[PDB]
Amino acid sequence: VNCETSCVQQPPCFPLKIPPNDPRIKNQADCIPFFRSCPACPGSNITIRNQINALTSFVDASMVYGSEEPLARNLRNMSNQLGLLAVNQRFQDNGRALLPFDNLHDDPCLLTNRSARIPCFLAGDTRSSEMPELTSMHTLLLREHNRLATELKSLNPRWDGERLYQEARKIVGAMVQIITYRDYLPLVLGPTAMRKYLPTYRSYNDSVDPRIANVFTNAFRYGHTLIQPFMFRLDNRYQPMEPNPRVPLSRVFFASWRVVLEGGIDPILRGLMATPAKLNRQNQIAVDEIRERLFEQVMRIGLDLPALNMQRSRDHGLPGYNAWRRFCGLPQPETVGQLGTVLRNLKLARKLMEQYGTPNNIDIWMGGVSEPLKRKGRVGPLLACIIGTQFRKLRDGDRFWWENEGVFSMQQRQALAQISLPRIICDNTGITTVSKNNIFMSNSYPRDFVNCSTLPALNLASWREA
Amino acid sequence: VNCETSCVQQPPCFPLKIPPNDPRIKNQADCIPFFRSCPACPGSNITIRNQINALTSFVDASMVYGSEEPLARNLRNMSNQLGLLAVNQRFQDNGRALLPFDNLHDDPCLLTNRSARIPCFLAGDTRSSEMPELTSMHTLLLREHNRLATELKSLNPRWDGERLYQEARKIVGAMVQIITYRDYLPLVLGPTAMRKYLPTYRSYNDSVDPRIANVFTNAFRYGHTLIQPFMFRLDNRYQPMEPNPRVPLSRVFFASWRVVLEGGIDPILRGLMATPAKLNRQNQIAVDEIRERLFEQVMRIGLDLPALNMQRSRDHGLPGYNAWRRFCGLPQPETVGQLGTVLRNLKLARKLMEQYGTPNNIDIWMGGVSEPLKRKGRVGPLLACIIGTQFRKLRDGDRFWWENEGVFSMQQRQALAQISLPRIICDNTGITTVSKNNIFMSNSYPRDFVNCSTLPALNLASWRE
Amino acid sequence: CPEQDKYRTITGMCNNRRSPTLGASNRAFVRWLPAEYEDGFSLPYGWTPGVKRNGFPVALARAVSNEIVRFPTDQLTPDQERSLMFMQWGQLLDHDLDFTPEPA
Amino acid sequence: CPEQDKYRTITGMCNNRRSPTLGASNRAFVRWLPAEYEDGFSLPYGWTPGVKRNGFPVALARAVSNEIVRFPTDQLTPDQERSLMFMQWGQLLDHDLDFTPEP
Ligand code: HEM
Ligand code: HEM
Ligand SMILES: *[C@@H]1O[C@H](CO)[C@@H](O[C@@H]2O[C@H](CO)[C@@H](O[C@@H]3O[C@H](CO)[C@@H](O)[C@H](O)[C@@H]3O)[C@H](O)[C@H]2NC(C)=O)[C@H](O)[C@H]1NC(C)=O
Ligand SMILES: Nc1nc(OCc2ccccc2)c2[nH]nnc2n1
Ligand SMILES: Nc1nc(OCc2ccccc2)c2[nH]nnc2n1
Ligand SMILES: *[C@@H]1O[C@H](CO)[C@@H](O)[C@H](O)[C@H]1NC(C)=O
Ligand SMILES: *[C@@H]1O[C@H](CO)[C@@H](O)[C@H](O)[C@H]1NC(C)=O
Ligand SMILES: *[C@@H]1O[C@H](CO)[C@@H](O)[C@H](O)[C@H]1NC(C)=O
Ligand SMILES: *[C@@H]1O[C@H](CO)[C@@H](O)[C@H](O)[C@H]1NC(C)=O
Ligand SMILES: *[C@@H]1O[C@H](CO)[C@@H](O)[C@H](O)[C@H]1NC(C)=O
Ligand SMILES: [Ca+2]
Ligand SMILES: [Ca+2]
Ligand SMILES: [Cl-]
Ligand SMILES: [Cl-]
Ligand SMILES: [Cl-]
Ligand SMILES: [Cl-]
Structure with a gap:
């Protein structure tokens, strides 16, 4: 059966059924399309079904370099010994590199605007064209690699391409680790959970399992609660940019043509820095642009991402709210009253009981984002525990963790501590004014902005080989 | 295959090669046969290879009742509504039941005595005929179940076969649990680890994973260090029993003929009660009956059980000694001298290092049985941890644990606390004198023995509807 | 695994020497429950x-x-302490960490 | 899994209601490492x-x-505080817990 078009429940389709009085889908014969994740062991009736991760779990910027040899190779420019990543040969962004185009059999980007005829981009990970905001980040990191590779070349003329690629890749990977652990995770977790789950690094521990845990692929979806219903584009004065400064998100999915034909990544990066995120609130969990209209422009019907999140946790055989609470060492509410206390919210607790009957059955995602946020973080205790635990394993269990002895020199580590996402944005775009640290906090222009000239660049001196 | 007869390393065969100047096998082109364990996901290049458990992990006497529906039916006597287990139709043991014979395609028991033509037994687990001492224990439990069902029938005449079977099966399962956790484990782990890994039971916890851990199938093989090189058979006087009072172990493997034709289970059960176990010592680890001559009568060549243990741990992808130490929160010796401190035996440490180069590479079984024994236990810290951890999960994660609310009534629990292995032997054999509690400690007749009449029987009154 | 490397492999293979596939691509997730x-x-x-x-x-x-x-879109609450960039880095990071394939 | 039961299943299925295969027979071992x-x-x-x-x-x-x-068999040290019955119960118990099939 074709899960894309059929509402018949037959492997591998697990379609979402429609309740009565649905606000959008009035036909109960209809459904929301859903393919079960691939089983790690097809057919088995001996093995408890598990799912597959196609990416390296390490924070190694595999979303830039790829996670498989053939692809990693294709992403590289091998016309010379400059160790560069391949860039688009058809279009440029005000003189700067864009991502190469991919060659998909069924290109969904082409569908978003028939006449424009712009295919999806090719990057380390297949989802780079999912939204233009994502594409701009991918494109930013590509530029930074080549920028790095060009500097290194100047320093070490004798270095061949292989050497230049690796050294630049090694740096980009550290930058990603640094931004993520220094700047990002503390604002996800809050200082308390930060201390608890990510105590001061010591060094590499070869007994720490670095694999992504199945539950993480659902819990880190908390991010969906942050999504604004518009893509926001601003000009060099940080004012609304024409044309169309506020596109409904349902018209940006897979819309690579907007990056290519509507002004590149500058207006999008500025939109990201100077527009606030959505705040997760117990009665304002996630917007209808993803709840009602996900991928509208490329699917027979609009998807509900939160619902998908919940169907996906069932597909993956994940235990309920309470089992995870227990796993994390958090109390497990049994009654509507007890749930009200955990949530500081009896109304929501009631609604949850009305849906689920028991806190034991609440889907991990739903339960996760229901909890009041930790101070100066954007998840509750449950998600902080799950997310915190994962990232510590990724850090302590990564032999190539940037602070790990022997990976970089002491001087290189000191130089690396100087990097920031704002600098990276200054060095690879036409943007000359950017967010103050912390870039994930700053969100009001011009209050939270500085001139690029005030920020020190990454100094690659200590990479000099005699 | 054929793993039995080729030395070609071809899946699923993983034969053990022979070191130069081996003391037994002079043919350098020969080898010790070995079959890789069946993969949980055959073929896959995505899932890290893992292995399969054919049995229920729970302490539920599945070796008596079976772990699969069809077998469990075949084991039942269904000619009537008495809920009995099928017994042998061809032979009896001084008028007591014996295990039914099985119907194997390739039967090893037949090989141990050409003229006798006595086949392997049929039981809950397929290894019941592996040694007559094991066979005797199975048979013991077979009669006990029948004894209970029979006595339940008198108490409750209206109960049908299914009811009597289940009720008796539940009692037997509880006995195994009690003997194991009350009498056995404490003497394996020692009092310190008993408290650490098996604190006082609270109640069923449905978030405790009861599965057996891969490493456990290997670590619980510590038992191999306890094996004596003979089967001891004594008489009603507890004196050596003719014809053969001390049969070398390499002539009892699969020797079901000995049970049927050489006196039944009593002489074997008496030998177990009044003969000491072998003690594990760091220069006397396991005997050559199992190391040189395992299954000698039923294979082209004698196996080496300890070597098998080690090839099996590699087959299973089991991490080495140090990783397991770390798992258990125990210090991990990096050097020879450190390993010498941990073992309190420098010589052994140097031998191990000579063999492995690093304590990280010592196979779990080898390293485990190498540790000096815990006070009043019979394993070291590493094995106690692994073993202790496994049994806590089997207990706390067993919804049908005997002490769990709703399982038995209060008065039933009270009555079950009276059971003992000695009593079970008194109830199902012709032995009238048995070991003092604790049966696993007592080993000297007559110092450590009592009259059966002094042990109270299990009182079934509270099972009456 | 080579006795001595210098940079990550692409697949993640060999990061952990004792268990070479841990963190490598196209493997089963680990389970915590x-x-x-x-x-x-x-x-x-x-x-x-x-x-x-x-x-x-x-x-x-x-x-x-x-x-x-x-919820009604007009009720939306701007986070006074987070930029949209905070959202976007999360998605970019997610995409360094996991992708769960499904059938075509 | 039935809503109410009274005895074990033979296979171990349903002992754990939330994850009804755990401890049941013919499933993968769990790994601790x-x-x-x-x-x-x-x-x-x-x-x-x-x-x-x-x-x-x-x-x-x-x-x-x-x-x-x-080692030399004649060096064997009998256990003064353990009976051979202590060895035997270990094997019997083992055989309640695990059997790893091979081809
Ligand atoms: C992490 C993460 C996943 C799972 C990755 C994996 O496959 O292992 C995830 C899932 C999805 C899905 C799949 C839904 C399904 O199960 O069928 C879609 C369609 C989707 C779309 C978008 N997401 Fe998401 N998501 C993960 C994390 C995040 C984060 C983390 C902070 C954010 C932010 C985010 C945002 C978006 C997004 C924005 C345009 C789209 C579209 N995702 N995700
Ligand atoms: C536990 C335990 C196992 C693993 C059982 C499983 O999961 O399959 C075990 C293994 C074996 C094997 C298999 C050898 C191989 O790996 O190829 C043999 C041939 C064998 C023989 C005997 N064993 Fe043993 N063993 C386990 C535990 C124990 C214990 C624990 C206290 C004792 C005692 C014991 C004794 C014997 C024995 C005595 C006659 C023979 C023969 N086994 N075992
Ligand atoms: C029932 O038994 C289980 C398991 O023995 C108990 O759950 C366990 O409880 C511990 C302690 O809270 C949990 O440890 C915690 O793990 C998290 C995640 O790694 C960590 O952040 C904490 O530091 C802490 O160590 C453990 O995860 C959890 N295990 C499971 C399977 O849920 C449970 O408490 C027991 N119930 C009762 C009432 O005793
Ligand atoms: N698993 C998954 N899926 C998505 O879209 C669907 C998608 C899958 C492959 C390529 C492009 C698009 C996501 N968007 N953001 N995270 C996503 N994760
Ligand atoms: N796994 C295993 N194997 C043995 O022998 C081999 C054997 C396998 C099947 C039936 C009979 C004999 C054992 N003997 N004691 N424990 C055993 N465990
Ligand atoms: C490879 O690099 C050279 C020099 O920068 C450039 O001219 C060429 O376009 C690059 N190729 C690709 C595919 O980006
Ligand atoms: C498609 O692209 C063309 C070229 O930029 C543009 O003029 C047109 O408006 C786009 N389509 C839509 C629906 O916007
Ligand atoms: C390495 O991590 C594991 C897993 O938490 C732990 O057993 C071990 O003690 C750690 N080692 C060190 C030195 O921290
Ligand atoms: C079943 O029980 C009856 C009565 O005890 C007995 O006579 C018969 O032999 C038994 N059958 C088997 C196969 O054990
Ligand atoms: C086989 O058993 C018979 C009894 O039937 C016995 O007389 C004979 O000695 C045994 N043979 C061997 C080789 O043990
Ligand atoms: Ca990665
Ligand atoms: Ca069992
Ligand atoms: Cl191109
Ligand atoms: Cl018969
Ligand atoms: Cl998980
Ligand atoms: Cl294991």
């Missing part, structure tokens, strides 16, 4: 009509979404 | 000639047995 399926080993909750989870009817994913997640 | 294979996922250490484990040659299982485990 045993899986819970309708049949205990493969069928997801909600698969068979009328089959309860732990004593209660499974709620339709779409329905929970309708009843708990839905 | 990631497995260690010559190739990371399948081949056993000692499989390929010359392939070292963690920087050292894999020791033939039979040699370790020869060099470390072997």
